[PDB]
Design a protein around this motif. Sequence first.
Motif, PDB file in Angstrom:
ATOM      1  N   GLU A  13       0.795  -1.335  -0.067  1.00 36.60           N
ATOM      2  CA  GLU A  13       0.059   0.111   0.021  1.00 36.60           C
ATOM      3  C   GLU A  13       0.755   1.127  -0.113  1.00 36.60           C
ATOM      4  OE1 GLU A  13      -1.498  -1.386   4.044  1.00 36.60           O
ATOM      5  OE2 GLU A  13      -1.648   1.033   4.175  1.00 36.60           O
ATOM      6  N   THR A  14       0.330   2.222  -0.566  1.00 31.31           N
ATOM      7  CA  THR A  14       1.019   3.641  -0.776  1.00 31.31           C
ATOM      8  C   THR A  14      -0.264   4.712  -0.727  1.00 31.31           C
ATOM      9  OG1 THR A  14       3.016   2.619  -2.046  1.00 31.31           O
ATOM     10  CG2 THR A  14       2.620   5.091  -1.795  1.00 31.31           C
ATOM     11  N   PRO A  15      -0.475   5.100   0.499  1.00 26.04           N
ATOM     12  CA  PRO A  15      -1.373   6.231   0.526  1.00 26.04           C
ATOM     13  C   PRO A  15      -0.873   7.546   0.511  1.00 26.04           C
ATOM     14  CG  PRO A  15      -1.146   5.022   2.713  1.00 26.04           C
ATOM     15  CD  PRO A  15      -0.303   4.331   1.531  1.00 26.04           C
ATOM     16  N   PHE A  16      -1.420   8.243  -0.717  1.00 28.73           N
ATOM     17  CA  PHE A  16      -0.862   9.540  -1.215  1.00 28.73           C
ATOM     18  C   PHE A  16      -0.981  10.481  -0.037  1.00 28.73           C
ATOM     19  CE2 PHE A  16      -4.339  12.080  -2.615  1.00 28.73           C
ATOM     20  CZ  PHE A  16      -5.260  11.142  -2.712  1.00 28.73           C
ATOM     21  N   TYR A  17      -1.916  10.163   0.972  1.00 27.03           N
ATOM     22  CA  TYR A  17      -2.311  11.154   1.823  1.00 27.03           C
ATOM     23  C   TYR A  17      -1.564  11.095   3.220  1.00 27.03           C
ATOM     24  CZ  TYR A  17      -5.393   8.249   4.675  1.00 27.03           C
ATOM     25  OH  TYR A  17      -5.801   7.475   5.611  1.00 27.03           O
ATOM     26  N   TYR A  18      -1.161   9.663   3.177  1.00 27.56           N
ATOM     27  CA  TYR A  18      -0.298   9.421   4.655  1.00 27.56           C
ATOM     28  C   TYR A  18       0.707  10.165   4.709  1.00 27.56           C
ATOM     29  CZ  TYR A  18       0.494   6.331   8.525  1.00 27.56           C
ATOM     30  OH  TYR A  18       0.799   5.976   9.710  1.00 27.56           O
ATOM     31  N   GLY A  19       1.257  10.552   6.191  1.00 31.37           N
ATOM     32  CA  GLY A  19       2.442  11.133   6.105  1.00 31.37           C
ATOM     33  C   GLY A  19       2.611  12.079   6.942  1.00 31.37           C
ATOM     34  N   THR A  20       3.484  13.296   6.852  1.00 31.90           N
ATOM     35  CA  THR A  20       3.512  14.377   7.362  1.00 31.90           C
ATOM     36  C   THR A  20       3.819  15.546   6.469  1.00 31.90           C
ATOM     37  OG1 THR A  20       4.703  13.377   9.319  1.00 31.90           O
ATOM     38  CG2 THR A  20       4.691  15.865   9.462  1.00 31.90           C
ATOM     39  N   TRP A  21       2.970  16.615   6.511  1.00 29.37           N
ATOM     40  CA  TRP A  21       2.706  17.534   5.287  1.00 29.37           C
ATOM     41  C   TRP A  21       3.308  18.936   6.201  1.00 29.37           C
ATOM     42  CZ3 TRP A  21       1.913  15.525   0.733  1.00 29.37           C
ATOM     43  CH2 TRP A  21       1.335  14.282   0.523  1.00 29.37           C
ATOM     44  N   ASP A  22       4.017  19.698   5.378  1.00 25.69           N
ATOM     45  CA  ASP A  22       4.435  21.143   5.750  1.00 25.69           C
ATOM     46  C   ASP A  22       3.124  22.412   5.217  1.00 25.69           C
ATOM     47  OD1 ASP A  22       6.623  23.123   6.623  1.00 25.69           O
ATOM     48  OD2 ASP A  22       6.242  23.847   4.506  1.00 25.69           O
ATOM     49  N   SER A  68     -15.756   9.283   0.645  1.00 23.78           N
ATOM     50  CA  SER A  68     -15.378   8.757  -0.862  1.00 23.78           C
ATOM     51  C   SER A  68     -13.817   8.638  -0.870  1.00 23.78           C
ATOM     52  CB  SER A  68     -16.061   9.607  -1.927  1.00 23.78           C
ATOM     53  OG  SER A  68     -17.311  10.004  -1.263  1.00 23.78           O
ATOM     54  N   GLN A  69     -13.383   7.759  -1.515  1.00 29.86           N
ATOM     55  CA  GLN A  69     -11.953   7.652  -1.912  1.00 29.86           C
ATOM     56  C   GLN A  69     -11.638   7.092  -3.107  1.00 29.86           C
ATOM     57  OE1 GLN A  69      -8.345   5.352   0.305  1.00 29.86           O
ATOM     58  NE2 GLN A  69     -10.209   5.114   1.262  1.00 29.86           N
ATOM     59  N   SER A  70     -10.340   7.568  -3.733  1.00 32.23           N
ATOM     60  CA  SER A  70      -9.859   6.948  -4.823  1.00 32.23           C
ATOM     61  C   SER A  70      -8.398   6.170  -4.674  1.00 32.23           C
ATOM     62  CB  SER A  70      -9.538   8.046  -5.737  1.00 32.23           C
ATOM     63  OG  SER A  70      -9.040   7.826  -7.208  1.00 32.23           O
ATOM     64  N   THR A  71      -8.086   5.189  -5.452  1.00 33.25           N
ATOM     65  CA  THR A  71      -6.721   4.604  -5.201  1.00 33.25           C
ATOM     66  C   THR A  71      -5.746   5.494  -5.533  1.00 33.25           C
ATOM     67  OG1 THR A  71      -5.514   2.490  -5.969  1.00 33.25           O
ATOM     68  CG2 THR A  71      -6.517   3.842  -7.920  1.00 33.25           C
ATOM     69  N   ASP A  72      -5.746   6.609  -6.299  1.00 31.87           N
ATOM     70  CA  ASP A  72      -4.837   7.704  -6.336  1.00 31.87           C
ATOM     71  C   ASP A  72      -5.472   8.821  -7.177  1.00 31.87           C
ATOM     72  OD1 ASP A  72      -1.994   8.848  -5.857  1.00 31.87           O
ATOM     73  OD2 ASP A  72      -2.145   8.806  -8.267  1.00 31.87           O
ATOM     74  N   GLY A  73      -6.147   9.646  -6.566  1.00 34.04           N
ATOM     75  CA  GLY A  73      -6.778  10.841  -7.294  1.00 34.04           C
ATOM     76  C   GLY A  73      -7.425  11.950  -6.119  1.00 34.04           C
ATOM     77  N   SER A  74      -8.509  11.794  -5.882  1.00 30.40           N
ATOM     78  CA  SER A  74      -9.072  12.276  -4.581  1.00 30.40           C
ATOM     79  C   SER A  74      -9.588  11.607  -3.510  1.00 30.40           C
ATOM     80  CB  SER A  74     -10.061  13.454  -5.446  1.00 30.40           C
ATOM     81  OG  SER A  74     -10.544  14.342  -4.441  1.00 30.40           O
ATOM     82  N   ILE A  75      -9.830  12.447  -2.384  1.00 24.20           N
ATOM     83  CA  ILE A  75     -10.517  11.631  -1.278  1.00 24.20           C
ATOM     84  C   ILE A  75     -11.353  12.817  -0.578  1.00 24.20           C
ATOM     85  CG2 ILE A  75      -9.881  10.720   1.033  1.00 24.20           C
ATOM     86  CD1 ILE A  75      -7.127   9.950   0.094  1.00 24.20           C
ATOM     87  N   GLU A  76     -12.454  12.300  -0.202  1.00 25.70           N
ATOM     88  CA  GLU A  76     -13.305  12.915   0.386  1.00 25.70           C
ATOM     89  C   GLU A  76     -13.512  12.508   1.805  1.00 25.70           C
ATOM     90  OE1 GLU A  76     -17.826  12.641  -0.365  1.00 25.70           O
ATOM     91  OE2 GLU A  76     -17.599  14.966  -0.627  1.00 25.70           O
TER      92      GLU A  76
END
Length: 135
Positions: A13-22, A68-76
């Motif tokens: 898995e590689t969730p594009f939203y997961y992590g730490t953002w500046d 709502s979610q996408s595999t890689d695009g947008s997330i609600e």
Amino acid sequence: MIMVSGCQQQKEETPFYYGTWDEGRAPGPTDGVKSATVTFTEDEVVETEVMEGRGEVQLPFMAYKVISQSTDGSIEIQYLGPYYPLKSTLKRGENGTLIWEQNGQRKTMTRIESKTGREEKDEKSKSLEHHHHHH
């Protein structure tokens, strides 16, 4: 000679939203912290603001649910707590950024390089605050 093609797909898995953002924009008044970073956890979101003399301070974690979610695009997603009925929008950005939309405002977040295969625990601090970094 040739250029060896190849792409494949990650089964990991590689969730594009997961992590730490500046959110390291320009500071403000007393409650206008110099910089901020947002940490996305399992089912909770943790905001961090770097305060002069205090350093990184992690705020009370806010629960969220995925509408709502996408595999890689947008997330609600919709939050839970005192600010639950207001949902937010997430999109993938350029370079490797996250587009966080809330209240009609479009924010571009950059991803910090940390937790690159190393356990990093959250910090717990109870702050009596009403700080609001804003435009």
